[PDB]
C-alpha cells in the first residue's frame, strides 16, 4: 500500500523514493526491507515494531546520523543489516546489541573515528563485518574480542598506523582479513596470533619498511599481498610457516635482495614475479615448488640458468628473464608447456642447435638487445609453431630459414653485418618483417 514497490515472496523494496521515515502500513510478515536511498536522518524508538519478522534490513546511503538504542529492539530474527554511506560518526554500540541473530553487519563508507569498548557485545552470531572507508586510527582490539565467530573482517581505507600484539587473538574462526590502503608502518611480533584459520591477508598500499615477521604464525594462508609498500628485503625462509600459499603479490616494491631460498618448499605457488631485485646473483633455490605457470625475473645480476629448470617445472608456461646477465643457455628440453620465452637485453652470445631443441608448444621467442653472434642452421628446425621471433640488435652474420615456415612476425632490426638476404620460398606466412641493411624486402 506504500508508494514504493513490493514482491510476492514477502519482500519490500522502497529504494530511492525520498522517504523521510520508515514506511507505514506494510504487511506484518515482512522478511526483507530496503530503504537504502531515501533521506532519513534518525530512527525513532518505535521504528521497527511493525516488522517483528525482519531478516534483512538495508539502509545504505540514507544519510542516517542517529539511531535510538531501542530502535532495533524486537528484531530478534534480523540476520543482515547494512548501514554504509551514512553519517554515523561512531559504531552504534547500544543500538545493535539486541540483535542476537545478526550475521552480517556493514558499516563501511562512514566517518567512524571511535569505537566504544563495549561495542558488538552480545553479537554471538556475527560472521561478517565491514569497516572500510572510515577514519579509524587504531585496531579495535577489545570490541573485536567479543566476536569469536567472525569469518570475514575488513578494515581498508582507514588510517591504521600500527597493529599491537594479540590484536586478533580471539578471532580463531576468521578466514578473510583486509588491511590495504592503510598507513601501517610496523607489525608487532604476535599481532596475527590466533588466526589459525585465515586464508587471505591483504596488506597492499601500506608503508611497511621491513618484511612482516608475524605471518609465520599463519598456517592456513592461501593468498598474500603486500605490493605498493616500501619493503626492500625478503630475508630467507619468510614463507616458512605458509606451506599452502598459492598467490603472492609483491611486484610493486623497492625490492633489492630477495633471499636465495626465500621461495622454497611452496608446493602450491602459481605465479612468481620479481622485478628490480638488483642484488640477486644466483637463481632462486625454488626446490619443492613444482606448480609454477609464470616465472619472471628481471633487473637482476643472474649470470646463469640451472639445467634442472623445467625438468622440475614441468607446468611452466611463461618464462621471462629479460635484462640480467644470462650468458649461456641450458637446453630447454622438457619445457613442453612453455608458450612464451623472453631473453631480451641479456649477454647471450650464441644459440647452438641443442639449446631450443625439443620444444613443441612454443609460441613466442624474444632475443632482442642480446649479443648473439651465431646460430646453427638446424637450431630453429626442432621447434613447432612459432608466431614471434625477435633477434634485433645482435651480431648475426647469417640467419637460418629451416623450421620458420610457420613464422608470422619477424624482427631483425639493427642486425648489421647480416648481408646475405632471406627468401620468400621458406618464409611464407610472414606479414611483419623489419631487416637491417636496406631494401632487403624487395623480394617480399
Amino acid at each position, epitope marked *: 500500500a506504500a508508494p514504493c514497490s513490493c514482491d510476492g515472496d514477502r519482500r519490500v523494496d522502497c529504494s530511492g523514493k525520498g522517504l523521510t521515515a520508515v514506511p507505514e502500513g506494510l504487511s506484518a510478515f515482512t522478511q526483507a526491507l530496503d530503504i537504502s536511498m531515501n533521506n532519513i*536522518t534518525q530512527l525513532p524508538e518505535d521504528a521497527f515494531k511493525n516488522f517483528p519478522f525482519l531478516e534483512e534490513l538495508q539502509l545504505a546511503g540514507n544519510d542516517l*546520523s*542517529f*539511531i*535510538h*538504542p531501542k530502535a532495533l529492539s524486537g528484531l530478534k530474527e534480523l540476520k543482515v543489516l547494512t548501514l554504509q554511506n551514512n*553519517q*554515523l*560518526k*561512531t*559504531v*552504534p*554500540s*547500544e*543500538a545493535i546489541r539486541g540483535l542476537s541473530a545478526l550475521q552480517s553487519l556493514r558499516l563501511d563508507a562512514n566517518h567512524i573515528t*571511535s569505537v*566504544p*569498548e*563495549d*561495542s558488538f*557485545e552480545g553479537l554471538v552470531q556475527l560472521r561478517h563485518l565491514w569497516l572500510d572507508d572510515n577514519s579509524l586510527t587504531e585496531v579495535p582490539v577489545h570490541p573485536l574480542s567479543n566476536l569469536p565467530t567472525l569469518q570475514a573482517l575488513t578494515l581498508a581505507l582507514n588510517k591504521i598506523s600500527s597493529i599491537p600484539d594479540f590484536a586478533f587473538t580471539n578471532l580463531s574462526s576468521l578466514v578473510v582479513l583486509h588491511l590495504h590502503n592503510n598507513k601501517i608502518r610496523s607489525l608487532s611480533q604476535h599481532c596475527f596470533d590466533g588466526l589459525d584459520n585465515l586464508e587471505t591477508l591483504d596488506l597492499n598500499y601500506n608503508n611497511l619498511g621491513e618484511f612482516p615477521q608475524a605471518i609465520k604464525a599463519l598456517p592456513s594462508l592461501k593468498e598474500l599481498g603486500f605490493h605498493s609498500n616500501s619493503i626492500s628485503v625478503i630475508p630467507d625462509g619468510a614463507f616458512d610457516g605458509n606451506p599452502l600459499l598459492r598467490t603472492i603479490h609483491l611486484y610493486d616494491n623497492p625490492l633489492s635482495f630477495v633471499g636465495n631460498s626465500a621461495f622454497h618448499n611452496l608446493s602450491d605457488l602459481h605465479s612468481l614475479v620479481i622485478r628490480g631485485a638488483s642484488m640477486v646473483q644466483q637463481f632462486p633455490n625454488l626446490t619443492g615448488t613444482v606448480h609454477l605457470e609464470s616465472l619472471t625475473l628481471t633487473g637482476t645480476k643472474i649470470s646463469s640458468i640451472p639445467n634442472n629448470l623445467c625438468q622440475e617445472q614441468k607446468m611452466l608456461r611463461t618464462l621471462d628473464l629479460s635484462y640480467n646477465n644470462i650468458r649461456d643457455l641450458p637446453s630447454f628440453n622438457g619445457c613442453h608447456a612453455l608458450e612464451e620465452i623472453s631473453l631480451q637485453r641479456n649477454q647471450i652470445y650464441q644459440i647452438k642447435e641443442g639449446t631450443f631443441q625439443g620444444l613443441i608448444s612454443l609460441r613466442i621467442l624474444d632475443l632482442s638487445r642480446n649479443l648473439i653472434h651465431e646460430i646453427h642452421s638446424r637450431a630453429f628446425a626442432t621447434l613447432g609453431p612459432i608466431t614471434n621471433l625477435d633477434v634485433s640488435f645482435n651480431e648475426l652474420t647469417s640467419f637460418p630459414t629451416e623450421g620458420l615456415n610457420g613464422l608470422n612476425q619477424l624482427k631483425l632490426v639493427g642486425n648489421f653485418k647480416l648481408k646475405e638476404a632471406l627468401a620468400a620460398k621458406d618464409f611464407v606466412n610472414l606479414r611483419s618483417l623489419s631487416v637491417p641493411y636496406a631494401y632487403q624486402c624487395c623480394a617480399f
Partner: nanobody
Amino acid sequence: GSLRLSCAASGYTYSPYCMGWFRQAPGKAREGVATVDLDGSTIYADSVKGRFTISQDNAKNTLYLQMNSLKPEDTAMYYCASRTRAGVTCGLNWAIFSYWGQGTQVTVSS
C-alpha cells in the same frame, strides 16, 4: 541569559554510570555538550568550554546544565541522556548512552 536547562530521571535513583547533555541542530547529527560520570569527572565540548557548566544533584537525580551569555549559534534542541553500566569510557559520544530524553528547544535571538 540565565538559562537553567534542568533534567529529571524518573526510572531509578541510584547513581547511573554516566549522564550527558547533547544538542541537535535541525536535521543534523547529535553532537555532545557535556558529560559527567559517577566520580564527578566532567567533560565539555570545545565550543562549550567556558560558557556553560554541567552540575548534578546525585541524591535527587536532578541534573542541571547552566548556560549564560548564549551565542547566536546556540539555537538547537537539547537532550538529556543517561547510561547505567560501566563497560565504557565517559565521553561526548552519542552511541554509548542507553536512555534518551524527549529534549527541549532553546532559541537564542539577540
